[PDB]
Paper text:
Mfsd2a is the transporter for docosahexaenoic acid (DHA), an omega-3 fatty acid, across the blood brain barrier (BBB). Mechanistic studies revealed that Mfsd2a is a symporter for Na+ and is selective towards long chain, unsaturated fatty acids including DHA (22:6), α-linolenic acids (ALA, 18:3), and oleic acids (18:1) that are covalently tethered to the zwitterionic lysophosphatidylcholine (LPC) headgroup. Like other MFS members, drMfsd2a is comprised of twelve TMs that pack against one another with the substrate binding channel located at a cleft between the N- and C-terminal domains. Here, we present five structures of the Zebrafish (Danio rerio) isoform B Mfsd2a (drMfsd2a) in the inward-facing conformation determined by single-particle cryo-electron microscopy (cryo-EM), in the ligand-free state and displaying lipid-like densities at four distinct positions modeled as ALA-LPC.
We expressed and purified drMfsd2a from SF-9 insect cells and discovered that the protein copurified with endogenous phospholipids. We therefore modeled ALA-LPC into the four distinct lipid-like densities termed Lysolipid1A, 1B, 2B, 3C (numbers and letters refer to the lipid and LPC binding positions). Initial data processing yielded a 2.9 Å resolution map with three lipid-like densities representing three merged ligands, Lysolipid1A, 2B, 3C. However, our in vitro analysis indicates that there is only ~1 phospholipid per protein molecule, suggesting that the lipids observed in this model is a merge of particles of substrates bound at three separate sites. To gain more accurate assessment of how drMfsd2a coordinates these ligands, we plotted the intermolecular Lysolipid2C- and Lysolipid3C-drMfsd2a interactions using the model for the merged ligand map at 2.9 Å resolution. In drMfsd2a, the four lysolipids are positioned along the vertical axis of the substrate tunnel within a cleft between the N- and C-domains comprise of helices 1, 2, 4, 5, 7, 8, 9, 10, and 11 that open to the cytoplasmic side. Since Mfsd2a transports lipid-LPC from the outer to the inner leaflet, we propose the following order for the four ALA-LPC during substrate transport through Mfsd2a: Lysolipid1A, Lysolipid1B, Lysolipid2B, then Lysolipid3C.
Residue numbers in the entry:
A (entry chain A): 33 to 507
B (entry chain C): 1 to 203
C (entry chain B): 1 to 201
The structure:
Amino acid sequence: SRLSVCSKLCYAIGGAPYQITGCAIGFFLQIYLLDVALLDPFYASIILFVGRAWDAVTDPTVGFLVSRTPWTRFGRMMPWIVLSTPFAVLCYFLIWYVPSVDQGKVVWYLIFYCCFQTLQTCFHVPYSALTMFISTEQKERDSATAYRMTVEVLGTLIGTAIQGQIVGMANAPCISTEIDLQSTGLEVAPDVQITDPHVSLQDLRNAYMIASGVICAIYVVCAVVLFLGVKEQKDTCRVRTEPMSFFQGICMVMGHGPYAKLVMGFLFTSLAFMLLEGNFALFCIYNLGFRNDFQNVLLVIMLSATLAIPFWQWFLTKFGKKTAVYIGTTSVVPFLISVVLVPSSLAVTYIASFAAGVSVAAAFLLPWSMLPDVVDDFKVQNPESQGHEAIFYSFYVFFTKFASGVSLGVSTLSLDFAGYVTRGCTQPGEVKLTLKILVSAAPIVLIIIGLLIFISYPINEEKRQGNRKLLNEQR
Amino acid sequence: ASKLELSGPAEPRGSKSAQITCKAKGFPEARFWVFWLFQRAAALDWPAANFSGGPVQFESRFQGNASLKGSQAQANAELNIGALGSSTATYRCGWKLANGGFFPSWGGANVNGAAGAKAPAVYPVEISGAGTGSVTLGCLVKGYNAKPNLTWPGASGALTFPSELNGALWNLASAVTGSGFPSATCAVGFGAATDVDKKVAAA
Amino acid sequence: ALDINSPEAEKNAKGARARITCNAGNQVGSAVAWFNQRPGDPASLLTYWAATEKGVAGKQSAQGASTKFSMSSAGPEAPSLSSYWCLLFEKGAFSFGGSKLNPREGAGPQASILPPSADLNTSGGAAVVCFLPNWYGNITVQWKTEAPQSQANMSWPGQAGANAAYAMAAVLAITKGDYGPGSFTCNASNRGTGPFAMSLN
Ligand SMILES: CC/C=C/C/C=C/C/C=C\CCCCCCCC(=O)OC[C@@H](O)COP(=O)(O)OCC[N+](C)(C)C
Ligand SMILES: CC/C=C/C/C=C\C/C=C/CCCCCCCC(=O)OC[C@@H](O)COP(=O)(O)OCC[N+](C)(C)C
Ligand SMILES: CC/C=C\C/C=C/C/C=C\CCCCCCCC(=O)OC[C@@H](O)COP(=O)(O)OCC[N+](C)(C)C
Ligand SMILES: CCCCCCCCCCCCO[C@@H]1O[C@H](CO)[C@@H](O[C@H]2O[C@H](CO)[C@@H](O)[C@H](O)[C@H]2O)[C@H](O)[C@H]1O
Ligand SMILES: CCCCCCCCCCCCO[C@@H]1O[C@H](CO)[C@@H](O[C@H]2O[C@H](CO)[C@@H](O)[C@H](O)[C@H]2O)[C@H](O)[C@H]1O
Ligand SMILES: CCCCCCCCCCCCO[C@@H]1O[C@H](CO)[C@@H](O[C@H]2O[C@H](CO)[C@@H](O)[C@H](O)[C@H]2O)[C@H](O)[C@H]1O
Ligand SMILES: CCCCCCCCCCCCO[C@@H]1O[C@H](CO)[C@@H](O[C@H]2O[C@H](CO)[C@@H](O)[C@H](O)[C@H]2O)[C@H](O)[C@H]1O
Ligand SMILES: CCCCCCCCCCCCO[C@@H]1O[C@H](CO)[C@@H](O[C@H]2O[C@H](CO)[C@@H](O)[C@H](O)[C@H]2O)[C@H](O)[C@H]1O
Ligand SMILES: CCCCCCCCCCCCO[C@@H]1O[C@H](CO)[C@@H](O[C@H]2O[C@H](CO)[C@@H](O)[C@H](O)[C@H]2O)[C@H](O)[C@H]1O
Ligand SMILES: CCCCCCCCCCCCO[C@@H]1O[C@H](CO)[C@@H](O[C@H]2O[C@H](CO)[C@@H](O)[C@H](O)[C@H]2O)[C@H](O)[C@H]1O
Ligand SMILES: CCCCCCCCCCCCO[C@@H]1O[C@H](CO)[C@@H](O[C@H]2O[C@H](CO)[C@@H](O)[C@H](O)[C@H]2O)[C@H](O)[C@H]1O
Ligand SMILES: CCCCCCCCCCCCO[C@@H]1O[C@H](CO)[C@@H](O[C@H]2O[C@H](CO)[C@@H](O)[C@H](O)[C@H]2O)[C@H](O)[C@H]1O
Ligand code: NA
């Protein structure tokens, strides 16, 4: 009656497409809308903000609809996944498709981005809930969650690598504006662009379509693996959702001290790093000058995060979790200062990419290490606890999924205000200043806010929480 | 709404200089590149562009001939043209889109680099002793240096040909295909008075 | 600079459909705008990025991928019979090509010669005026006293609103001392398989 290793592998693989599509979108959608779709950056800001705000809004609504799903012959979560996968991959393919429309291309991208976010929610939320139905024993659920949290990292790495190495192989020409007309008396005639395997804008669009097709094929294959290898057990213990009690427990969780502190801290730190994820490709292309090697920079960051997860696990098991979260978020601050203060040296950018990957691994690993010390304290403080960490996560996901959309929309609107040239050879000084601020001022401010919230942390690592763990032995 | 108000027509001389203004309304002028164009009975040429809070970028043909200036305390742009002689054209100011490179709004201001100001001479060119059904009359307006206004008394068969340069003055012709010919007169209208109406006689 | 050229400066256009072509000297990556200019008015933006309209009617569409672009009208109207320009915004030096639409009509030329008046002969001048008021297409005027001459100034109006036909005025300027040999003939060469000659003695 134990949960099979192959069943846990299939369950973990079923969560790869969410991270593949999320990393591909969050790292390349802004530059696709600005330089490949050739949209006005006001429209691109609208599209990004509305898509992520709809990603968030649809999370609790689809969760509530999933809570009311009856048990069919195939299960309670499998019908949603199966009936949502083909429409989700169709909408994802049409996200990166450029229609031949005379007007309202922004409407096309809004419709398909919001539809894909809705269908990906209808895939993930039943998937996220599936871990309570795969096995009755909590240990098997924890093992499957370890398999998942793990692949999830591998899927982010694989999606970043695939999108970067496909859409980065086929380049395209760029627009030269009046700022690029810096030579008229010299009259330089270095006609070397023609003596090349001439790439076009349509070649770049075809590369984006090929990357989307590969990601959709992986989505379909992993959905098939998740459907075949995972079967719901239909356990007798079925606790009701109780939405009024859910709201009461949400208010109780937000009223708790350490829980609210963890939220505010993580929220702000993840917001800074999502702002970096959004406006870092443009910073590499137009400030660092790596319009051909920005995908390699992103891959180096992802590889650094993957190799720095065990380092930060050793750091938290050895030197505690207070100094770990005090230095992990602030490690990127000197390098975020250094990238905008040097004349774009390649070695400096790669070293800062490695350090930024290390900091990302710390920032997205350490709060999950802190979380059991908060759960024990909440159990000591509130003996009655029925689904508090689930709504705590829901709150964190919603607020990150809304404020990251707000941040990305504000960033692209600021780029429009600064005069961002649609696939320009070089951006003007205002756009480069905005891109420097969006990676070295706003993320540093958000990291400082999150660090100040994490300083006011009454748990004080295990030094009280372990005592609360003693009370966990008492109750 | 975003609009650009320009100075009126200018009539400089061969070796003078002419400054053309362009007042910008409805948008921050310092945030956009204001462009100057050149249309001389032909396609649109491209003198230069000016960022009103920064640099000016010229075309190599107009370097040393054009000079672009921007008064951001007035939200105004200026195009100063140096030595003249073939710069008689229409100049349009238009602010660029901050992203694309095309010109949404446009201007229009005429420059006529000629010399002299004379009263037109009206000659009643008529038939040469022939007639078959409808007959064609005419009126020759020769030797003026402005825009004329030729009219016929209530007859709508006129074809007023565009004026042309002969030396430093303008020539123009009018033709009316009148069937019955009891009496016809050519009345012209000029800016420097001289509203002369001459009747067209036979032979 | 990047060369932009419209192959047809004038396009005869009835209703139904009409396509205006633009050719670039370089692969501009669909960075082509289309402007419409009416007489006495500045250019008005119609299309940008070779496909996107700017508040224009739905008849004005545009296609084109690289080095070859087209602007189409779903149905031409009376306001649509104006001049059209294609601009590049690929490189910093911006260039145009120029093209115009014209209504379709029949044919049939005309000519009439007029000698200098007595008032002009009084004030030391002699202008012989040839009027070609109604024809459709392109025409040429030759002045012959005894041999062809190249001392004539020629002017052409646009296309008539009612007749949809063109006109032409050819003025031969000649002094009183140059009014010696005598007879002047004006010869017109339209699509009529023969030059129409109007002469005076
Ligand atoms: C000097 C170089 C600086 C470089 C910057 C590049 C930076 C950061 C890269 C990434 C941040 C996000 C990637 C990590 C994913 C975490 C894996 C995970 O399993 O954790 C997430 C889980 O909690 C889901 O929730 P999440 O809110 O994060 O979803 C947000 C969705 N939305 C976009 C709409 C906001
Ligand atoms: C190359 C890409 C590599 C990138 C690096 C960025 C970061 C390091 C990431 C590290 C570890 C992964 C962290 C995974 C986040 C949690 C997984 C997740 O995305 O969470 C989904 C949620 O829906 C399921 O877990 P749960 O809700 O139960 O959260 C409460 C957990 N628990 C109750 C057991 C305490
Ligand atoms: C170039 C790369 C070279 C090398 C690296 C090899 C890499 C693999 C990369 C990644 C996989 C690592 C996944 C790490 C997951 C971090 C999360 C974690 O390891 O732990 C989270 C903790 O939050 C779980 O919670 P907990 O265990 O207490 O379960 C019950 C909780 N609760 C009682 C409240 C319900
Ligand atoms: C991208 C396309 C390529 C994908 C190719 C498919 C790769 C699939 C990954 C399989 C990796 C197997 O991973 C390995 O599985 C074995 C089972 O045999 C597990 O085995 C171990 O865990 C289980 C559960 O605790 C124990 O019962 C077992 O005694 C122990 O040996 C390990 O947890 C793991 O190290
Ligand atoms: C578009 C992307 C979104 C994906 C949405 C997918 C949600 C799917 C909703 C669940 C399916 C609803 O359809 C469901 O089918 C089964 C038939 O076996 C029936 O449901 C019934 O199943 C069995 C009997 O067969 C009994 O437990 C019970 O009588 C009833 O629950 C109902 O007809 C309906 O409740
Ligand atoms: C599994 C993932 C892979 C799935 C692959 C599916 C193929 C996707 C290729 C895109 C083909 C769709 O191409 C798109 O079609 C629609 C309708 O025809 C067009 O849309 C056009 O027609 C519709 C008519 O209702 C109007 O809104 C408007 O005239 C215009 O938007 C787009 O201009 C075109 O770009
Ligand atoms: C193509 C799209 C992306 C698809 C990516 C698929 C890659 C699959 C590679 C194998 C990933 C699974 O990796 C898996 O991670 C977890 C980490 O706790 C390990 O699981 C291990 O921890 C759990 C819980 O402590 C225990 O059951 C046991 O100790 C062991 O199984 C497995 O030993 C390992 O096999
Ligand atoms: C664990 C699963 C995840 C695996 C992640 C890594 C798998 C994919 C590794 C491919 C890495 C390719 O590494 C690099 O990519 C870029 C673009 O593609 C290319 O780079 C090449 O072209 C660019 C052009 O400016 C220059 O940097 C240089 O000429 C050369 O390096 C080469 O292909 C390769 O030098
Ligand atoms: C598992 C592997 C998954 C791989 C999935 C790969 C599927 C996508 C492959 C890319 C092929 C795209 O093919 C490409 O499509 C576009 C439009 O659709 C065409 O583009 C053409 O259509 C429109 C017409 O309005 C114009 O904008 C364009 O100028 C014209 O060239 C290209 O001529 C064609 O080469
Ligand atoms: C065209 C796109 C589709 C391409 C698909 C390519 C990948 C396909 C691989 C799918 C993984 C197959 O996974 C295989 O399925 C069988 C189901 O009989 C599972 O076998 C097991 O399933 C569940 C485990 O909870 C048990 O109830 C069952 O008793 C047991 O046999 C295993 O998980 C695995 O042996
Ligand atoms: C919810 C929060 C979302 C997170 C993103 C918010 C980060 C802020 C976006 C960056 C905007 C600042 O971007 C930068 O600001 C300065 C003013 O301070 C402005 O600077 C510009 O305008 C001023 C005029 O006042 C000029 O003197 C200056 O030469 C010019 O560069 C520009 O706007 C831009 O260069
Ligand atoms: C979350 C909801 C967000 C608020 C809802 C959106 C309200 C605004 C919708 C768009 C209305 C007009 O859109 C805004 O106005 C001008 C027209 O003056 C548009 O047009 C502008 O860009 C285009 C090129 O892209 C130029 O051809 C044009 O000359 C220029 O004025 C822009 O596309 C946009 O800046
Ligand atoms: Na996740």
